[PDB]
Amino acid sequence: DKYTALIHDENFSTLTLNVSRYPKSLAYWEKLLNYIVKASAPICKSTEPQLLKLIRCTYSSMLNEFPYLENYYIDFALLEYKLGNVSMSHKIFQRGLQAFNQRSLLLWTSYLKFCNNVISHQKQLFKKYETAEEYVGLHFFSGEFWDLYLEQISSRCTSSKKYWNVLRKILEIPLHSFSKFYALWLQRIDDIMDLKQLSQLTSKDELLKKLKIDINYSGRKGPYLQDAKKKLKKITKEMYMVVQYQVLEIYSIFESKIYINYYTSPETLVSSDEIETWIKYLDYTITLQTDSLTHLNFQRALLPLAHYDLVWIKYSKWLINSKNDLLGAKNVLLMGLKFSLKKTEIIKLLYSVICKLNEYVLLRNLLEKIESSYSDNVENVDDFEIFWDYLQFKTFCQNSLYSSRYSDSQSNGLLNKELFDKVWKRLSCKEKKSGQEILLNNLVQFYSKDTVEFVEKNIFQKIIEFGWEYYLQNGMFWNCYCRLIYFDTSRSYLDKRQYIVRKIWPQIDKKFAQSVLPSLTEFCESYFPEEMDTLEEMF
Amino acid sequence: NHMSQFIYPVQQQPSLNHFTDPNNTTVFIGGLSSLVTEDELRAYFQPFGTIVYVKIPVGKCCGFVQYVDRLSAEAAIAGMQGFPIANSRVRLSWGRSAKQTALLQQAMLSNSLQVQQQQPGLQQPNYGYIPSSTCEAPNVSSTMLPGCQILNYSNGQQVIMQGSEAVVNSTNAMLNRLEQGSNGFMF
Amino acid sequence: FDIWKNLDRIRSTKKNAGQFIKGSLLILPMRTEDKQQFDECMDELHKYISKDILRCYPQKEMLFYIVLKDFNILDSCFVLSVLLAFQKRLWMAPSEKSYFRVPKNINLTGSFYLPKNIETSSIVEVGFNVVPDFQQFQVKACHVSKFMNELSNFFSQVEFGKCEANVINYFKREYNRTYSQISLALYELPLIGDGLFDIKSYISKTRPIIETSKAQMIKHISEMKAYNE
Amino acid sequence: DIVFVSPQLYLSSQEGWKSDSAKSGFIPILKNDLQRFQDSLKHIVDARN
Amino acid sequence: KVFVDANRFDIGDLVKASKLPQRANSRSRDETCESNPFPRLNNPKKLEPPKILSQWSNTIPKTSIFYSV
Amino acid sequence: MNDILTDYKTFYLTHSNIVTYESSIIDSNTFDPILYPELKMSNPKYDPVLNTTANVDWHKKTEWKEAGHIGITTERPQISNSIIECNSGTLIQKPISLPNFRNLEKINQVKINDLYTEEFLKE
């Protein structure tokens, strides 16, 4: 049969194994799919169910890897529709609309187009359009959406009330094509043959008050109605003034600069000017203070570049401050963890959002998740920002868990059997791992008796005994080992300076001096001008 | 069927001054104290983006700065407006650079033309650059993936930014700037 | 700041808080590290709620789903005030260990779920909710007595009903899925290099154009130098 | 006939990287190639070790 | 697979039988992302400006805010 | 400022705990030592102000007058009562009132205080 003839082919094995080896390419997915479709080409109900199960699972498994592909949710829906079950088509349209958080123009337009044919019960059908309207209605290109909706009223509705009702709303929206709908409005004003039909525009009171025209007027009506059409066309000309201004600004500044409105792939790069125009377009949209159009223009901006973390951070910021919604910001950063490749800034800002939200079990859980990613070695990671952001928020947790061991009530932040072994394992790698001194500088921050003794003996002493060359040639090491003794509150000045000079300094080897002197002079120049000479005589 | 219902809108050009120039970067910062150095002003305008600096006039109590990208410039104008430097509320807006300033001042005496010349563009595609981003310090073979910042500028050399080393370098200079800043060496 | 006197006070002034809302469903998930600590608090909580109005669904792979349905407003005032304080107590005052007594200087925070169909300040609805068919509400930091008043004023407005029977099972499905995705996302974090991307062809494609984008930058630096000086 | 594989769950050391039934994110591969597939990833694991 | 409308599923098969008898006298579906990897290399035209009514064409703001080339 | 905020964020995470933390937010104003430095970093004048009346006084603010173009304050026409917030399902109840406008005379009026010319070139 055709199925087994497809399995034993070499191209299926090669294309498949490429996909499973390289998941995020999307080039191998689309070849695997385009091939398995073409093998099935008489795709109608006759073809055997094993093959349909494979091709279907191939679509559904591809759309999970790339949650933004509009033409593929559409295409898989159409496959299910040609195959003869519309319920599966509905469901996976719902799935695509849910992947975009209910705002994508193409899935709503291509969805409702499908919905016109397969759904009776006019009321529900219109509820689909009212649901689409409150989401994607204000999209700059959404006019063609409205062209559907108006097209569906005039065919369905005998009353014509709802057509005036909706078209009146379309007049106030700064779409890309506003003029198309202004022509329909002006024409429908032109076709009004009676005073009674002017109540369709607005009610009886606002016409007699604002424009001072009466529907009940009794007399020679014709010239009065001709005056009324002029008085009605003037204000529509004014609405045309405002909305034209807005559209021409939005196009002339932003929308004209945006050349790519679609997702492409995780391997796509976008131009810098396009980034800049998305940023400024989002600031402008925020300034308009229209929440629907604001979330829309974030989700609109999000699919062109989803993988940077750039628009994710901002879209968490405007929602954490302007709207003052902290949970919504957490949820934005969580959905940003999936698409964004860099993930470091999002996970730092996410640690902060979770801290302020006062969910500690969720943050500590997520630290367990990120340490489980590396197989419980975060200390061996190449990229330092992950280990550092992990280590300081981990510290903030174990301060709360375990009561402080040390006198003066100082919590033990970075000195603990769990974390100090992590730090020391990070330090034992020396030149190979990047962080180094940054991790060391924060070991000087304790400022007490017990902890200056602890950090004195357990690192700065052992590191001398093992005698590693990288840490001894370094001036930051000796500078920090001076600043650790020098800021102690237990020591007086005499034993402090005498301890630094009589012990700390002579432990430096004279061959290291050339590297050690510049950084260790900066400590002595500021704090110890008196003993500056005995420093120079040593080296 | 001669005339048509719709046309594309045609619109006039606004004379090209330094206020209508979409490429303008340099921000004129007026109302300074003239007790301030230029390295202090750099400290103010550094975090908003990478700077190609121009000059601070002497005795004129107004300076100006120039960034690489306009997004950083606007982020600096909106970021600092009315922000006191040495107890003087600062008033800053758009302004040109030094050479175009010379070309203007020669015209101010002779009151002839004052024909502006807009700043040069970046010839835009660029897929590697992310505007309003700084390389905090200086072998790199990267993946060139979208999330990371591929190219960048140096305080005039285009450098490839290593995402791992950039954070540890920036934090290193951060912890140095505190110790030198407290004792008076850096300001 | 004791829950019983405050619950009687809200019994008095709430204008008929006794009756239960039709088709009423409330879902609060929570995670606790100590199962032995939470099992006794919930066990002591089931005494007055008669197990029909409140049910605890554990999820094992610690995460508990707290489902509270067919409830009067005065009942949710009681339960949410118990649980939201028990969640903070582990970090705040582990020595307290009195379930119904809220220790001083603890502000109640958290989030709860309601069905997407509800018909309508400390308690706020969030924009951009994750779980598709449901809506989550934030409770901003508040004193307990303030929380009773805000919540009692909140459930007076909401009028909702007509939910499918097993919907809780749908909530489990969605909620487990969303965090499965972010866990799978954190497991993709270290392996970004070369593992799933096929970087060889990607570098072969992007390197020549990135070199040109660099040439245009080193061109723009000189082209700007000629403009400034 | 066909096995369903999750290279993410496999490289992350998690248990369920494969199953016979269709699940949301897995890629269908030929069963005999499964062993072969493991080979293709081993060097990646070898880089992490 | 979507906007070409000849190669679709719902409307795809019908267009073939809708082709005229063609008595006397393309965009295949197989395309992938691998073609046109960078959508902008001097390829695209910028988006066409929004139209305007011929009647009210004098309503337009006279001058732009910025200098276009 | 970025330096004190970042270094103090790290210092606070390392040397403090939660019991000290959650007691440290008044909540009259929104302030947290973990999160607030992250919002305040590039913004010197950031004020965490929660007010509903900023909605009433809106559109007279310079951020509204310059939005898509900075330094240049245009006066932009707008419809006083705008329907684009109300869904079309909620419009069919009552007939929609006629649009009330504002700022419609100033469409061509675009003003700039030129701060480069008059305080520098003019001296």
From Swiss-Prot, chain A:
Miscellaneous remark of the record: Present with 1730 molecules/cell in log phase SD medium.
Gene3D superfamilies documented for this protein: Tetratricopeptide repeat domain
SUPFAM superfamilies named among the record's database cross-references: TPR-like
Origin species: Saccharomyces cerevisiae (strain ATCC 204508 / S288c)
Protein name, per record: U1 small nuclear ribonucleoprotein component PRP42
Its job: Essential component of the U1 snRNP particle, which recognizes and binds the 5'-splice site of pre-mRNA. Together with other non-snRNP factors, U1 snRNP forms the spliceosomal commitment complex, that targets pre-mRNA to the splicing pathway. U1 snRNP is cotranscriptionally recruited to intron-containing genes. Required for U1 snRNP biogenesis.
Quaternary structure (record): Component of the 18S U1 snRNP particle, a subcomplex of the spliceosome.
Keyword annotations from UniProtKB, A to Z: mRNA processing, mRNA splicing, Nucleus, Repeat, Ribonucleoprotein, RNA-binding, Spliceosome
Gene name, Swiss-Prot/TrEMBL: PRP42
Keyword Manganese: no
Motif residue range(s): Nuclear localization signal: 229-234
UniProtKB/Swiss-Prot annotation, chain C:
Protein name (database record): 56 kDa U1 small nuclear ribonucleoprotein component
Subunit structure comment from the entry: Component of the 18S U1 snRNP particle, a subcomplex of the spliceosome. Interacts with the nuclear cap-binding complex CBC1-CBC2 (yCBC). Directly contacts intronic sequences of substrate pre-RNA.
Compartments where found: Nucleus
Further comment: Present with 361 molecules/cell in log phase SD medium.
The organism of origin for this protein: Saccharomyces cerevisiae (strain ATCC 204508 / S288c) (Baker's yeast)
Superkingdom field: Eukaryota
Purpose of the protein: Component of the U1 snRNP particle, which recognizes and binds the 5'-splice site of pre-mRNA. Together with other non-snRNP factors, U1 snRNP forms the spliceosomal commitment complex, that targets pre-mRNA to the splicing pathway.
Residue span relative to the full protein: 45 to 293 of 492
Curated annotation (Swiss-Prot), chain D:
Localization (cell): Cytoplasm; Nucleus
Note: Present with 782 molecules/cell in log phase SD medium.
Family of this protein: Belongs to the SNU71 family.
Subunit composition and interactions: Component of the 18S U1 snRNP particle, a subcomplex of the spliceosome.
Function: Component of the U1 snRNP particle, which recognizes and binds the 5'-splice site of pre-mRNA. Together with other non-snRNP factors, U1 snRNP forms the spliceosomal commitment complex, that targets pre-mRNA to the splicing pathway.
Protein name: U1 small nuclear ribonucleoprotein component SNU71
Source species: Saccharomyces cerevisiae (strain ATCC 204508 / S288c) (Baker's yeast)
Name of the coding gene: SNU71
Swiss-Prot record, chain E:
Annotated compartments: Nucleus
Region (Disordered): 21-50
Domain of life (superkingdom): Eukaryota
Subunit structure: U1 snRNP is composed of the 7 core Sm proteins SMB1, SMD1, SMD2, SMD3, SME1, SMX3 and SMX2 (Sm proteins B, D1, D2, D3, E, F and G, respectively) that assemble in a heptameric protein ring on the Sm site of the small nuclear RNA to form the core snRNP, and at least 10 U1 snRNP-specific proteins SNP1/U1-70K, MUD1/U1-A, YHC1/U1-C, LUC7, NAM8, PRP39, PRP40, PRP42, SNU56 and SNU71. YHC1/U1-C interacts with U1 snRNA and the 5' splice-site region of the pre-mRNA.
Family recorded in the similarity comment: Belongs to the U1 small nuclear ribonucleoprotein C family.
Role noted for this protein: Component of the spliceosomal U1 snRNP, which is essential for recognition of the pre-mRNA 5' splice-site and the subsequent assembly of the spliceosome. YHC1/U1-C is directly involved in initial 5' splice-site recognition for both constitutive and regulated alternative splicing. The interaction with the 5' splice-site seems to precede base-pairing between the pre-mRNA and the U1 snRNA. Stimulates commitment or early (E) complex formation by stabilizing the base pairing of the 5' end of the U1 snRNA and the 5' splice-site region.
Note: Present with 2140 molecules/cell in log phase SD medium.
Protein name according to UniProt: U1 small nuclear ribonucleoprotein C
Gene that encodes the chain: YHC1
Residues of the full protein shown: 117 to 196 of 231
